[PDB]
């Protein structure tokens, strides 16, 4: 029984970062030889595990989180980082053990005139904890006058829209990010290499 990485890499659609999708991988054998995206990753870095050893290491669970941010934000998908994506959208713990993978998807997530389906949280009352998801839509109160659900002066809707035109600078182009987590928590191993 094979690990379903193909639906993580070859997925037609990707979640927005505030609503980041998590796939759970268990009870399979992992074929790590496949050249996903013709191995055309702008970022490829693990923390804790060695990619060299993964073919003969076993795990209890592999969690696969995926989303879309812009190019100069990928720097934040790493342990101990701060910024809008790390504070308000997707936070990695300082003790992260797993891989961050990212590629430029300007060819997919950019429209003439702009793709506006991808969102990110611009305001939040406090920073996210590691692996927290926040799908709230409450008007954010940026002043002293309370906001009773009305957008306006000092009253902001917390999600904003990435505007992905194919002519943007590369730092403003859409990137697909996959974040693999390798867990080994006092339980039987279900995910191994061949």
């Amino acid at each position, epitope marked *: 029984n094979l690990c379903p990485f193909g639906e993580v*890499f070859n997925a037609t659609r990707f979640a927005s970062v505030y609503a980041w999708n998590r796939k759970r991988i268990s009870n399979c054998v992992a074929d*790590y*030889s*496949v*050249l*996903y*995206n*013709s*191995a*055309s*990753f*702008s*970022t*490829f*870095k693990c923390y804790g595990v*060695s*990619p*060299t050893k*993964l*073919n003969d290491l076993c795990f209890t669970n592999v969690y696969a989180d995926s989303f879309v941010i812009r190019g100069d934000e*990928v*720097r934040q998908i790493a342990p101990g980082q701060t910024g809008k994506i790390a504070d308000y959208n997707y936070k990695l713990p300082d003790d992260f053990t797993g*891989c961050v*993978i990212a*590629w*430029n998807s300007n060819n997919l997530d950019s429209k003439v005139g702009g793709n506006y389906n991808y969102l990110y949280r611009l305001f939040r009352k406090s920073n996210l904890k590691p692996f927290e998801r926040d799908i709230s839509t409450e008007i954010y109160q940026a002043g002293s006058t309370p906001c009773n659900g009305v957008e306006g002066f000092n009253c902001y809707f917390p999600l904003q829209s990435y505007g992905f035109q194919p002519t943007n600078g590369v730092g403003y182009q859409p990137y697909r990010v996959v974040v693999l987590s390798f867990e080994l928590l006092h339980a039987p191993a279900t995910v191994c*290499g*061949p």
Partner: antibody
Amino acid sequence: QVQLVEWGAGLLKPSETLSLTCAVYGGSFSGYYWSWIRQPPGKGLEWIGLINHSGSTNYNPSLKSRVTISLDTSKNQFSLKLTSVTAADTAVYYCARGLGIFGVVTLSDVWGQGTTVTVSS
Amino acid sequence: NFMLTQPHSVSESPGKTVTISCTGSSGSIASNYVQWYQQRPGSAPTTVIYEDNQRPSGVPDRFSGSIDSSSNSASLTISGLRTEDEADYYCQSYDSGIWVFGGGTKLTVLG
């Protein structure tokens, strides 16, 4: 102990085709990526491309138009084809075994000893 | 389009320590792993460091690698310099899945 050798050609005239074979002794091509790397005399290293057990390839864009890497699980060999050869293709040509994930080779552990290829008229 | 540039040559007396820097340009070096090769003349390259700082089995612990993100640099450090250490050293990373090598640095153990 696993070991590689590459061989073939050597004296080429411009426009000809470079063909090299690499034989693997002491292992198989499973769970390893197989690259060709070249080094012009006195210059640095340049990665040509790789191939995995399934036969998928990923090539260096500097050569992609003219390069082919092919596998032969039956004879335990893999090969290089470099067409439309020029003098800038004179180098020492290595085959090397790699380790990694998803096409990213994070450790190249064993190399062959290398064959030289001279392109002159 | 990511460039890895290394010094042309570095030298040091035996038993001392040397380091070989490898600076990235047009991108961030921390986004991919750096590998370091040693090439003794007339032989194929062998790896001494991989994944920024890991040593393959059989490589002395006096080879060590490091990343300095403040300057977009990796560095190969060899301590207790022996003459067997004389060689060209190549750092190697990636630009979107394609291997990128450095210029090479020729290490001379002053004899």
